[PDB]
Paper text:
Orotidine 5′-monophosphate decarboxylase (OMPDC) converts orotidine 5′-monophosphate (OMP) into uridine 5′-monophosphate ([name]) and CO2 during the final step of de novo pyrimidine synthesis, which is essential for producing DNA and RNA nucleotides. Recognized as one of the most efficient enzymes, OMPDC accelerates the decarboxylation rate by a factor of 1017, and exhibits a net transition-state stabilization (ΔG #) of 31 kcal/mol. Its unique ability lies in achieving this substantial enhancement without the aid of bioorganic cofactors or metal ions, relying solely on interactions between the substrate OMP and residues at the active site. However, the key catalytic amino acids at the active site are highly conserved, including two lysines (K281, K314) and two aspartic acids (D312, D317), which form the so-called catalytic tetrad in the sequence Asp317-Lys314-Asp312-Lys281 (numbering from the human enzyme).
Given the observed binding of dTMP to human OMPDC, we synthesized 5-methyl OMP to test whether a nucleotide with a hydrophobic group at C5 exhibits improved affinity. Using the standard ITC-based activity assay, we were unable to detect enzymatic turnover of this substrate. We could, however, assess the binding of 5-methyl OMP by thermodynamic ITC analysis and estimated a binding affinity of K D = 404 ± 220 nM. We wish to note that the estimated K D in this case is only a semiquantitative indicator, as subsequent crystal structure analysis revealed that decarboxylation and formation of 5-methyl [name] had occurred in the crystal. In the crystal structure, 5-methyl [name] exhibits a similar binding pose as observed for product [name]. The most significant difference is observed for Lys314, which is slightly displaced due to the presence of the additional methyl group. However, the configuration of the other catalytically relevant residues Lys281, Asp312, and Asp317′ remains unchanged. Intriguingly, the 5-methyl group binds in a hydrophobic pocket and is sandwiched by hydrophobic residues including Ile368, Ile401, Pro417, and Met371, as observed for dTMP. Stabilization through additional van der Waals forces has been reported to be effective for other inhibitors. , In our case, adding a nonpolar group to YMP or BMP at the C5 position could provide further stabilization and enhanced affinity. The addition of a nonpolar group at C5 could, in principle, prevent a H-bond formation with a water molecule, and thus provide further stabilization. This assumption was corroborated by analysis of the analog 5-Me OMP, which binds to OMPDC with nanomolar affinity, whereas the natural substrate exhibits an S 0.5 of 30 μM.
Numbering used by the authors:
A (entry chain B), B (entry chain A): 223 to 479
Write the structure that this text describes.
Amino acid sequence: MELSFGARAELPRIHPVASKLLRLMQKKETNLCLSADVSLARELLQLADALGPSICMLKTHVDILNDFTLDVMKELITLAKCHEFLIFEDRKFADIGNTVKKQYEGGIFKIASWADLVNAHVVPGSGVVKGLQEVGLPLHRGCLLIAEMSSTGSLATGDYTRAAVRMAEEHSEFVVGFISGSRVSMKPEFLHLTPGVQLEAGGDNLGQQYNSPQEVIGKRGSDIIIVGRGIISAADRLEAAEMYRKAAWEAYLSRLG
Amino acid sequence: MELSFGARAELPRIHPVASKLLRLMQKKETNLCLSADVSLARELLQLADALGPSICMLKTHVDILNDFTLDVMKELITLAKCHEFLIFEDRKFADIGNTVKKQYEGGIFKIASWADLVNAHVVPGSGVVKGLQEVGLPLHRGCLLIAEMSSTGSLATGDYTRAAVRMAEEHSEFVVGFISGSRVSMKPEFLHLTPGVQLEAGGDNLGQQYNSPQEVIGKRGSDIIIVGRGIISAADRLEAAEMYRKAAWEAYLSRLG
Ligand SMILES: Cc1cn([C@@H]2O[C@H](COP(=O)(O)O)[C@@H](O)[C@H]2O)c(=O)[nH]c1=O
Ligand SMILES: Cc1cn([C@@H]2O[C@H](COP(=O)(O)O)[C@@H](O)[C@H]2O)c(=O)[nH]c1=O
């Protein structure tokens, strides 16, 4: 029983953040997350504004913005609200709960104040999620757990991936899904977001491996494609994003019937 | 069979950063790394100045500083040079090489400009090291790989730990050791730093587990203890740091003979 994004948004155990995401994916016909790996706030905001209508999510690495300020993130929130997409900071929290709680709430980035979604590696055990969730629950935030990775030599396989799935299931009041290369949970309440995506076959020179939208959404059963250089390196980033959106969207439609 | 810190600093394959660290550990009779998990730059610099004589290393989480600026790291360097300790930013790089390279050099933190040491998780595969190396080698830096973690439910065990050791030994131009709970490499050129250390048994309420300096250095074979709250929460932080220094140092001496 493969359900549309809109119906999954109505599932009994759905987290509010995931429901909001799934509703806008259905409304806008996009399951594309732009990975805005840029070093200038001006470029980040110009990309968010021009590509907002094409994306369900904008993934940030605020630690590579040379001119980060909280005012930049306020402007980004305004665009996310205007164009209707979630903001996902790819922070990869990956330490004991006492530390990650401080990294999520505090410091100069104050990630919890502007990020709808964050992610975490599961290697430290569930305390990483327990620490994050203390901050995220009053703020109605959600978290994605990295169950699989797209890079060569990834150790996020086998029992490690199963441990991520179990951890997500155990913390479903905060964890809304996974970073993975394929469907890893059979529960339709969880989102699957897949990086390592490009239209053409290949990789990079530092261990990144790419698969196509049709492969990851259609055959591997993921929900959302995360695309950075496949868009950001094009001259016309809008046309590139539209190519990726149509690819991922039609791949999703094909598995409904 | 076991070599003093001073003799390890002279080994043919020793990395310069490890050598520099080992030499100052011997000179100052300290194998204590202070974990300065604080929210204010003022507190970071006051602790570095007051406790610098007692430590071989100061471990930072710059992303928890509410008022981070590069001028704070310039002042920290001056203290590190004066008191002779290394600066270890506990960044936990943990993604594909192309991303971590930018995170290490760029953004607001400019970590490579001031951190003698950083660490990385090995879950992405060796690309995480290859990316960091492109920034750290020109800047004469070292990196620690997280082979084991101190937290309940850690997945950094078994084959994962072995994969970390192999990764380190194959990138010895840049990787100088590990975050681990024990000796994980038999090569004396590599340093073992162990967090989760307190004098008394216990843990915290978010999955941290503690072992004593004598257990970690003496029976488990590690080189350096990383201590945060055990010192920072003490009324007399200098006396606490001295207690941890003497404990770890004597356990190291005992192991030698
Ligand atoms: C957890 C995870 C994250 N990213 C992130 O996804 C984006 C992929 O970008 P690109 O499409 O340019 O390779 C980058 O921001 C990267 O750090 C991956 O590529 N793979 C992963 O397994
Ligand atoms: C990789 C790793 C890091 N830290 C860090 O070591 C310090 C431990 O501090 P405390 O002594 O306050 O528990 C913290 O900064 C924490 O994030 C651990 O505790 N355990 C780990 O496995």
